Subunit: 337 residues, 4 copies
Amino acid sequence: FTSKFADELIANAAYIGTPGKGILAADESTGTIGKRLASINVENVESNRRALRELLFTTPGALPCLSGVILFEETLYQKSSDGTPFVDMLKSAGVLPGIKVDKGTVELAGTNGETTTQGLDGLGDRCKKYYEAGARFAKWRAVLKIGVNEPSQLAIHENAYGLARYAVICQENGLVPIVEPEILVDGSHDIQKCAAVTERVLAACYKALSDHHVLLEGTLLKPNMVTPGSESAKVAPEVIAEHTVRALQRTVPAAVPAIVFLSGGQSEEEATRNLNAMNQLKTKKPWSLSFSFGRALQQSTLKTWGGKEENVKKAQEAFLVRCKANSEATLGAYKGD
Amino acid sequence: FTSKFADELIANAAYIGTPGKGILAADESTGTIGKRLASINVENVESNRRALRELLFTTPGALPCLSGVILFEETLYQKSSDGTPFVDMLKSAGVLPGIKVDKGTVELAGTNGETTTQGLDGLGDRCKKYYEAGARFAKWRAVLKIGVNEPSQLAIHENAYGLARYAVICQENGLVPIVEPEILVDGSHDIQKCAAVTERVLAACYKALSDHHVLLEGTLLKPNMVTPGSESAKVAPEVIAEHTVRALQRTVPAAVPAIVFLSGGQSEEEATRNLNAMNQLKTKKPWSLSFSFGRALQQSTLKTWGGKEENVKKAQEAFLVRCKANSEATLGAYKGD
Amino acid sequence: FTSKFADELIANAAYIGTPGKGILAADESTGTIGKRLASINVENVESNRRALRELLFTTPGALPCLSGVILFEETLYQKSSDGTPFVDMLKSAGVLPGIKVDKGTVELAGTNGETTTQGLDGLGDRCKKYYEAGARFAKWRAVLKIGVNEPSQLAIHENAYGLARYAVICQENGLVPIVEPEILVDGSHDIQKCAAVTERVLAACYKALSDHHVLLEGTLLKPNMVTPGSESAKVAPEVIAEHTVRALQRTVPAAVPAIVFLSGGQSEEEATRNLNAMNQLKTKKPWSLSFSFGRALQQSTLKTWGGKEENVKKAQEAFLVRCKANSEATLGAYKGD
Amino acid sequence: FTSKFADELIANAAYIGTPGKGILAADESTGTIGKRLASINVENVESNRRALRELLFTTPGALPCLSGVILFEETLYQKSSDGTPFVDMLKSAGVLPGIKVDKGTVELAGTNGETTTQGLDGLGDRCKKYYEAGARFAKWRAVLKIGVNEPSQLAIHENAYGLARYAVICQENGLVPIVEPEILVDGSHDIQKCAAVTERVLAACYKALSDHHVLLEGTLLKPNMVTPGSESAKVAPEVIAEHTVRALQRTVPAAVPAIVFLSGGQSEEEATRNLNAMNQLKTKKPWSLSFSFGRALQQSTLKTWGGKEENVKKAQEAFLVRCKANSEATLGAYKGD
């Protein structure tokens, strides 16, 4: 398998990992963004979703910190207040538009609330329409949990091979697949457990991608950082960095151009600090270590904004703060704000 | 000497050397651009200079290939057709605006047509106005020639210490100085001679910068590539690369973040190919090897454009071709057109 | 799985990959060395085997080019003419002694002459005795072939999991396992085929090693270079290098410290030139690229020596030539004889 | 200036900077070693100096940690107890023998106790004899002090140009020159002052080496680490590392293959820790950062070795500890002992 998009996939995937840049995940479904809007007393109508995404995308200074922005299908075709398609707004600034293509998760019978991710049906034709609409990368999220018997062989197998198949289809249709095998932080396991599970899961995913003949140079990885569980004592950025980078060195081929971490419920500042520490570690890292943050990029902007329009300039200043901080983190040059 | 701009100088100088980006030198005076406009039957009025710079700067896809654009003073204050100041147009795309600050050359008594560069008088106050107008780097060109007795000790000394003093003033006023000691190609000397002269000159320049207590991590170097003289047989990109990188390894401190080659006499394609070969050399290179090209970036765009407006879309496609090619060259990934 | 030897394994595996050094494979059994001795009219008695190994190991200048020497069990316990144990001779020069621990190959029923490698029975106790005798690394050779239906899923699976189990036992007993999945060069397949098969095989091997909880940082890889088949047209070193390094980038974790190529029927000079080209390639290589050569290091020495003792000084100068050339090749600094 | 030794100079200088290796400075004159021997109640006769250097050089395990050993003229021609010439002992183990060639310092009139280094007279003929005796590198120590008006322009100029001229003569006779501009720690100045003085001194030295047409690729630098003065509070290894590496980045061309730090006033453990921290700094370092230690390698060995021969095995185990620790420090892998 050589795609006709092979050169463009390799160029775009490498571009996403440009030092100083990372990805804004703005791909929250109509429901998920509902929750976010609720959490700051705003109705979930298309009026407000458009307003919020426009706030982000027209923040002075923000787009230059961004190699990519993950959109939801609605937003991919939406225009701003002045009739500018968001995808053009992105492109003008050198930002690749991305598209969430998974159709969410379902529970696996005979497991303890483990899931598999849906979305392969008609995915080829979707990806082609998305490419035609200006998308150049894709997202698919697989979710694994840590427990006594988790993640199970079945959960791993299903999620790895679901990611691999998604990756091929993406590449056939000119979209760089972000491979996202998220290991949830939930629990009182220690960082060593997280490390072992992350190592096992990534090794399963790269084996699957090899079996599916995926062009690794035309892909991205969006893994969790290796951290203690959500109920365990927090640990310094340097400890997160050591464990995380060691896990990646053990599993992720050099052919992969960039690793764009998910924040997974870490605070805005903590996510930045952890990423920074990874870029300050003197060790073999044959991939860019960057960000693909949603909540960790938007949380404080959502709050400053609240509802209406006096707080746009203030919320845009807040958004710039986090974009700039994460950009600095990719270069290992974040000093704190 | 610690500048209050020290952090911003270091961040901006590092930014210019971002993999995938380089500098467009669009800083040709009112007269020099006249020549270029003449050469394609366009009158040299402010109407057309603005139109040409706008053509370049509003090329879809081009700005993302550019970490910086060197402007002439006129262009620094000019706006586009839609009222956007060029410096804002550039910033929105993450491009640093730069300013040519030298006042040209004068001949040195007692030499064989060797020059020194003028421009120190009132330079501080100029740089400060330029900073306030949105400029964040500066350019000063010293010119050296190769002859039986050239470059002379006097020419070298004058040009190195003129550059050093310019560099300090720049940094005091928040402009990253591009240090440009251009060794002209004119003559029948071979590449070995060029190498020895380039090594001598750069060693003189870094000595001067040390004596002037310049913050090297807040500077840039725009040297000639090491090539045979104008009357000698041209040589393969691999040979240009070997001699050039060896010269830089011998002279340019690792503290300097990036080396942005001038194109000099070189064609569009030749400049790209030579830069690419440098980025394919596996050797210790503690600086970004990038581009600061004028004619090598504009030549084919100037021609396609000709005069008027049906040839804008076509000329912008031509400009994108060269921007994209040089961007690929900074990554060592240029495969040819 | 944490070994008590973990720190020493990681230090020794990293040591083998020291730039300027590689491995001499002198581990040919009593029969195989018989063939080699025959091929230059010498009887296969313990007298001569000792004489030949002593010739190699007492070559002025040779041992400094060697981070390791793979021995056969006989040689591990043998002394030189003057009562110096070879293992002390090696250690004095900073050379790690290694031990061949596989018991050869057997054919797999239902395949077309594909093999699996034997030797797991009592391997733990062997490795412990070998460690006590001064061995610090081990060798196990798996063999895969290329054909219409080869290598088969069964061959791959058997060889990968045989290597993995061998690797853990090694590490439990303080021997750095060289993981050697040799894909035989035999056939008229092209280099693209070799690339695809090498990529599939290595991916299967690292999956197995992960399943077996092997410490990658305490291992080595001895793969075939990626080459056209033995019956296909030879190609330039730079082509071998491009395909080989690409295959390794796609499959071998950064955690592995070093890759010591087998020569696999290449000539002395060709092996050196191919290794050199790999170290001249500007590309992400998170491991040392070195040599583990047998015939490619000894062939010309065997011949110069012949049988008799007038040709020792001459044969030792020949051996030094190849040691020195391969040492230079590890640094990318080999220019030809 | 092209030496006939140019290839061998470049290969040997690069060899000295092999990761995992550094230099033992055992070159203390008849007087200086007197002091060391006195300090542990041993008479300064050639009997005992030989015994001490033999102790070091015949330590099981030590030589593999060493790319070079700097000798005093006496030791260069000495043999061990068993008739083995030291230079053969070194070579057998892959260690380059080096020779101290300066003839000590003299005071500069019109300065405040500043010195210049002697030794240029007949140095060519000495270097040639030394090369013939098996030496392949050389050492010359310049001494600078830090005061209100020190180091003076005159002291710097004299020492830089003395080093440059020494370097040329070395290279003409096939010895890699170690350039050693030692800035003494004496005083109450802070680390920032040491940094500024080290940067000024090194910049003067590389300017001089350029003027003298020295082949940088065939040289070594032995500078002080950047530290607080002798009367100021000691500072953490990370702070030493940051200031030291920054000073070198600012001044030492990439063409120089290795920087072999002098230990100066530092303890064994402190020297190792500081070196290690430099190799753990994530920053552009286009040279090997290694060691050329005297006191920091020998101090604890001198003490364990009382004078008599029952304490040799114990003192050799102590010497191995420091060799092993510094070797690990060159790799950034020292964890403490």
